[PDB]
Amino acid sequence: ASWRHIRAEGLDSSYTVLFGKAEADEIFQELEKEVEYFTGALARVQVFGKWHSVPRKQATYGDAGLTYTFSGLTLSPKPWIPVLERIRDHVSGVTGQTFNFVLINRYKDGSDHIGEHRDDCRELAPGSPIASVSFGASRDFVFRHKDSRGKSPSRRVAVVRLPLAHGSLLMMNHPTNTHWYHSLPVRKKVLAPRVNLTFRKILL
Template identity: 40%
Template sequence: MNSPEVFTPPGAHLSFYADFIFPEHAKRLQETLRREIAWRQDRIFLFGKSHLIPRRQAFQGETGLHYQYSNLQLAAEPWHPDVKSLRDQLVPLCHVPFNSVLLNQYRTGGDKMGWHSDDEPELGKNPVIASITLGATRRFVLKHRYDKSQPKLTFDLPCGSLLIMAGQTQHYWQHALPETRRIHEERINLTFRYIIPKDTSL
């Protein structure tokens, strides 16, 4: 694994590893996760209406963890051994004790992720998000939340790549995975994160 490309636009810190996982291993891992993960297509509520999310997802992590966004609450399933192995590689690299992962399956370029920030309270003040791509290369875009004069940042994330979003990125920037009709292959994305456990003793 080579040293990362580092990007530090105002209010963000991004590290990009194009070759975090060797291509052969990444392909095998994609095939394994496609078969063995219990993928689900959930509904979220936006502006008072229920919508099927345009992708499939799964949430794994330590026992008892929950993650909530758009009025959708996910309870952590047990770690898949291959996913836990990736987590164990990322912990010393990122200096973060990741305890959960949100997996997204984009079946074709028609599946997408809209503009958002990973700024839920349970992620803490300056969350570190480590994002691994398996499968099709998709375009990942970031935009500043407040300063419209800041240019958008665009990354083409290839199979086996790792993008780490750290510092104040989630405060000042939003990100999205736009729809693209020219891609017909699957992309699986794993976003590792640390969720602050709730104090169940109270």
Template identity: 45%
Template sequence: MSQLSLLEPPAQTDNTVLPWRHIPQYLSAKQQQLLRAEAASYPFERPTLTVFGKQHLIPREQAWFADAGCNYLYSGLMICAQPWPHYLSRLRQQLEREFNQPFNGVLVNHYRDGQDKMGWHSDDEPEMVAGSLVISLSIGAARDFDIRHKQRPERHRIPLASGDMLVMQPAMQQHWQHSLPQRKKIASDRLNLTFRQLIPFYHQQ
């Protein structure tokens, strides 16, 4: 697929342009299989978050792979960069060519089953490079991805299947929030990879 068609945002019937693009089946079956197998050895963690004074384990597992100096302060937690695994690094190179943008970090979320989830948020941390794309890729169980506008009562739901890509334009983080709701009947797991561009050494300045 050409870079232009990947970036072209969809128009709604009222001609509003939405700042994301869903590309079904971006990853080949082989890529999905290799990444899934590689993920079996990722150093997943479940850090503890403090919400209203109470401590909670995050309802999923996560790992952060990034270049040196690209530590990430995410939901109040500093996550340190782990070195890039082989197939994630190859995928990063493919995305850098496709989108003509450097991606120096990837957050891997592992939802062990439909109980695991992610709450409403925007990927708008100050260490993210202004104007950069966030590329999300899904492998495993199909899950709904919800999007809501920050100011008006507008919502969208995108069913993300294995191999799908979601290109998030900068305006998505500025004006919208997203979440991955619980789906208690889903018994199988899902990996989500979000490739990001961070300002190196932001937290050491």
């Protein structure tokens, strides 16, 4: 397989296209048909002392007993469904890595987005890679170094930007998530939905 390697100080990621257009279309269609997203109380987070409905849709699937907590919200995983098992298994065969959990974020259009954060969970296994699989509209994905944020930053490490295309895989390897914040910024010109799956290895 041919990878585009994304390297910088404390940044170690790789990008590849897994599926051609026809297959990625079929997978996207099946995801749209089958994935059940959280609503209501399970779609609200607390950040900086205020509660917000998330500006997107979220779903969690994976092995029994696991939980996923961030920003005052705890999500329980739904049992695996065939479309998700298909992708999980393909990623595993391509990378040599295993996953027991997937977070699904759906961005209805360019106005849907996700703010800056690190995936520095306690429930995430130490040094475990994260596999980010994208379907639908291409969206720009942004890495920012932790020491380069704020009015008076410690460092001036350049922002790393990557478009994530339909049918693509972004592998985020250790120690990417200790040093770098990532986000999916608003892109007003994007009119079409995007579904992103982040496969992870969660501790019970």
